[PDB]
């Protein structure tokens, strides 16, 4: 713990073809385990992770049917959004949804999750109370007042608070050998000139899982925030992740700088210097 399940749904409308492209992806603890793409051979949800293979035909069919339902839902929402914003015709727009639930180490519910976005910007989202809504802007107020009249909230809460948790449990038990594993980070430091009397020090973390991690540079016992570049954790390509933290150091004083790696699977933090 924590633990989570999330479904990332994207829909992109294309000119001339009044059928939007619908892509939905499901993750557990942030690992992809199911996917559906309407531009596929014969659209149907597919296993992304091994532990999803034990699911019978009934599981897939039902899941795929919902997708067919979302294609519709997203087809109309797009059309409605197109209007709210006085947008033209024959263009390309994006509607995205994030939904799911989180659990503590005990597997009980920590938070319900539901949120939408249009054209890359927050549109409307369910509040942590799973009863109220926050509308990004004017148009979202229309959807907001429209959803409060029908009581959409209660239904989502029903799902997010129950069904969501149940399915997450099953996925968690089915692939626990896969999901519940931790791969500790391996670290090393690289040296690179930056300016006349300035140097670049790069701290590396490789092959760790889950993706979560913290990298810091310190002088004596204080962390460095200035001229300290932190790059976005990236996928190794085999399930593990990589990341590095760089800091600009005066030439000849490197030795007084230390790197530290904090990660779930580490008994204690990794501490290293240049060498």
């Amino acid at each position: 713990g924590p633990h989570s399940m999330r479904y990332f749904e994207t829909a992109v409308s294309r000119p001339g073809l009044e059928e939007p492209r619908y892509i939905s992806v499901g993750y557990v603890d942030n690992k992809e385990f199911v996917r559906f793409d309407s531009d596929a051979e014969n659209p149907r949800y597919e296993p992304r992770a091994p532990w999803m293979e034990q699911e019978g035909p009934e599981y897939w069919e039902r899941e795929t049917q919902k997708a067919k339902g979302q294609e519709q839902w997203f087809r109309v929402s797009l059309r409605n959004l197109l209007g709210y914003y006085n947008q033209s015709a024959g263009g390309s727009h994006t509607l995205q949804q994030m939904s799911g639930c989180d659990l503590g180490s005990d597997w009980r519910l920590l938070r319900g999750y539901l949120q939408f976005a249009y054209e890359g910007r927050d549109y409307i989202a369910l509040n942590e109370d799973l009863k109220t809504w926050t509308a990004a802007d004017m148009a979202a107020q229309i959807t907001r007042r429209k959803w409060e009249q029908s009581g959409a909230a209660e239904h989502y809460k029903a799902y997010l608070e129950g069904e969501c948790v149940e399915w997450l449990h099953r996925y968690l038990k089915n692939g626990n050998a896969t999901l519940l594993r931790t791969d500790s980070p391996k670290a090393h430091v690289t040296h690179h000139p930056r300016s006349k009397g300035e140097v670049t020090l790069r701290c590396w973390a490789l092959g760790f899982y889950p993706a979560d991690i913290t990298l810091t540079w310190a002088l004596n016992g204080e962390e460095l925030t200035q001229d300290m570049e932190l790059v976005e954790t990236r996928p190794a390509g085999d399930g593990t992740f990589q990341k590095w933290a760089s800091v600009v150091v005066p030439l000849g004083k490197e030795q007084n700088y230390t790197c530290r790696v904090y990660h779930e699977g580490l008994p204690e933090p990794l501490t290293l210097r240049w060498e």
């Binding site: 839902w73 109309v76 929402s77 409605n80 959004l81 709210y84 509607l95 939408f116 549109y123 409307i124 959807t143 429209k146 959803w147 029908s150 959409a152 239904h155 989502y156």
Partner: peptide
């Protein structure tokens, strides 16, 4: 569920 109602649309946007």
């Amino acid at each position: 569920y109602p649309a946007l």
